[PDB]
Design a protein around this ligand. Structure first.
Ligand SMILES: *CCS(=O)(=O)OC[C@H]1O[C@H](OCc2cn(*)nn2)[C@H](O)[C@@H]1O
Lengths: 312, 76
């Protein structure tokens, strides 16, 4: 494999704007006035946890702000959607979204516009706050930032209809389903994949609830086990390329994580056995990927894809 | 008895003690080995973060269970 440069100059320019304007900036909903405890819900401005988590990390004396939802995270999702676009073309019966459409019904032009929307997806964030109000406020912020940029500078590219749809994709409005639109689905799948870098084996392989399938099981239902595992591996190699910690995987350990043998066996039958070693975060590559679009882009383009990415 | 505590990357520390201990207890134990303050420690089990007060018996932690440990780096 070896993906090479997939983003045209227009997309990179937009990445450059989003980095300058949003992703390079300090989180602002931080400090004592944004602490939270369930037992004193209205003691501060926060109505939930997470405002002061992981605001920045120090590398070679330089603060990298918003390391969990910064440039690298965002750029990674563009690479995921590219891979899954091809993956979808290999499926005889792709997943039908609530709009009646599938990933394979997107054109290359659609993919470009989708990628541009992905750049703003977490751009509205003002902290690592996790709870619903914060999540919804921050996605609305990212949606509005997208719209303000698109209406000034991209009207030769997006129709008004398309500005509305992509805005809604970013907004993630309450009542809208994960698979509301094919565009939305692909955006969310891409975000989902990236969570593997910071979740436990339970969320990734087993499901955080009897209802929810789990990240890798989800990739497998959509894409088959072979392509789904390849996608999984690809994402782990993007973690390592951008200097992020790669979690280990051990399917033999799954029965020892306090989950009902029921669900452990289920995941085993879907995923099969996996033993792969994790890897410590690398500060130098973290800096390379976090402080400029070229740094991040040049690290991602290099990484090998599955061979089917490249096939006709 | 023996349980394992692991970072997401697989760095594993093996612990001795008992169902009787609380999670705050086990976090203090991790402190004494590796020197990590409990306030920075999130222990996971069944993909859900554990609260300091409850015992290992409550989350049914037994022989050779794996708990996961992430370090809350507050923004520093
Ligand atoms: C990969 C998870 S994330 O980056 O989306 O973070 C969201 C999540 O982070 C917090 O948990 C992390 C953790 C576990 N133990 N100590 N910190 C919250 O659960 C939040 O929803």
């Amino acid at each position: 494999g070896a993906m090479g440069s997939i983003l045209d100059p227009e997309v990179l320019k937009v990445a450059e704007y989003v980095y300058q304007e949003r992703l390079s900036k300090p989180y602002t909903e931080v400090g004592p006035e944004w602490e939270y405890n369930h037992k004193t819900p209205y003691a501060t401005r926060a109505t939930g946890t997470g405002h002061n988590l992981q605001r920045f990390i120090t590398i070679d004396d330089q603060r990298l702000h918003r390391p969990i939802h910064g440039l690298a995270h965002t750029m990674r999702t563009l690479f995921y959607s590219q891979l899954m676009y091809e993956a979808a073309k290999r499926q005889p019966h792709p997943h039908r979204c609530a709009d009646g459409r599938t990933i394979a019904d997107l054109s290359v032009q659609d993919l470009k516009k989708l990628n541009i929307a992905q750049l703003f997806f977490v751009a509205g964030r003002e902290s690592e706050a996790s709870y619903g109000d914060a999540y919804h406020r921050y996605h609305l912020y990212g949606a509005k930032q997208f719209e303000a940029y698109a209406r000034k500078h991209l009207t030769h590219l997006f129709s008004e209809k398309e500005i509305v749809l992509y805005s809604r994709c970013i907004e993630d409005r309450i009542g809208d389903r994960f698979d509301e639109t094919a565009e939305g689905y692909l955006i969310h799948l891409s975000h989902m994949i990236d969570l593997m870098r910071c979740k436990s084996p339970v969320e990734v392989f087993i499901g955080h609830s009897r209802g929810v399938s789990g990240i890798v099981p989800t990739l497998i239902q959509l894409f088959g086990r072979e392509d789904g595992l390849d996608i999984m591996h690809y994402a782990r190699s993007l973690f390592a390329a951008t200097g992020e910690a790669v979690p280990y995987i051990s399917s033999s350990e799954w029965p020892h994580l306090g989950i009902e043998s029921d669900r452990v066996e289920r995941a085993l039958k879907i995923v099969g056995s996996l033993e792969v070693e994790g890897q410590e975060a690398d500060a130098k590559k973290t800096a390379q990927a976090g402080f400029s679009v070229d740094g991040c882009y040049g690290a991602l383009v290099k990484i090998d894809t599955p061979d089917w990415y490249h096939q006709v | 008895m023996q349980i394992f505590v692991k970072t997401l990357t697989g760095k594993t520390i093996t612990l001795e003690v008992e169902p009787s201990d609380t999670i705050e207890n086990v976090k203090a134990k991790i402190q004494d080995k590796e020197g990590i303050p409990p306030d920075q420690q999130a222990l996971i089990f069944a993909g859900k973060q554990l609260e300091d007060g409850r015992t290992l018996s409550d989350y049914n932690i037994q022989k050779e269970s794996t708990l996961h440990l992430v370090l809350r780096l507050r923004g520093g």
